[PDB]
DNA sequence: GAAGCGAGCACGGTGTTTCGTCCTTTCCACAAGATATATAAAGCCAAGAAATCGAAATACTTTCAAGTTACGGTAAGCATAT
């Protein structure tokens, strides 16, 4: 069965109290009866730290370098930027060049 | 003239070849092997065609990468009001 949007709060609370070291013990203490890899996929999907925020000036240097070095015509492989630049996903990373 | 000095030819050898069996075949022959045929019940071997199932190819599903429409909220420098 899927989540009910009622375990992520306790999940992240216990993970912050323990330090995100051993998810197995966190999953066992939360009492979800599912594998750690099954609840972590939803925790990291509801987590907010995955995204980034307003763009600085120094990162524009890297963004322009990764373009002058492996860009191709009108298409920019933003996946390479996501691989090199951490925090930036694929969806909203296109606005950095649009 | 018969005793002292140089004398043929029958004879006695190997070695080489010839000749003439005994050899095992090729070939042939008289007596007798299935060789045709009649079953017949049994189970198994074994060389051809027809139905069935495994593999996979090209096809369509389906799912996963890209991304640009449409969309909702804040921040700066010029214009304008009493």
- Whole-number Cα distances in Å, A7 to A14, A40, A61: 11, 11, 41
The nucleotide minimizing the C1' distance to residue A93's CA is B67
Contacts of range A58-62, beta carbons closer than 8 Å, 24 or more positions apart: A59/A85
Structure-block tokens of residue A47? 């987590």
Helix A36-46 to helix A8-18 angle (10° resolution) is 100
- Whole-number Cα distances in Å, A25 to A3, A19, A28, A52, A94: 19, 12, 5, 29, 39
What was the experiment behind these coordinates? cryo-EM
Which residue is associated with the tokens 């600085």? A56
Asked if strand B contacts A75 at the CB level, meaning under 7 A, the answer is yes
Resolution given for this structure, in angstroms: 3.9
Give me the CA A92–C1' B70 separation in Å, rounded.
14
Residues 79-98 of A with CB under 7 A from strand B: 79, 90-91, 94-95, 98
């Amino acid at each position: 069965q899927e989540w009910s949007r009622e375990e992520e709060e306790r999940l992240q609370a216990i993970a912050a109290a323990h330090g995100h070291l051993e998810w197995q013990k966190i999953a066992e203490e939360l009492g979800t009866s599912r594998s750690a890899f099954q609840c972590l996929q939803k925790f990291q999907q509801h987590n907010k730290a995955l995204k980034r925020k307003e763009w600085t000036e120094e990162e524009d240097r890297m963004l322009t370098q990764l373009v002058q070095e492996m860009r191709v015509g009108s298409h920019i492989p933003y996946r390479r930027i996501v691989y090199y630049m951490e925090g930036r996903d694929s969806m909203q990373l296109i606005y950095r060049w649009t």
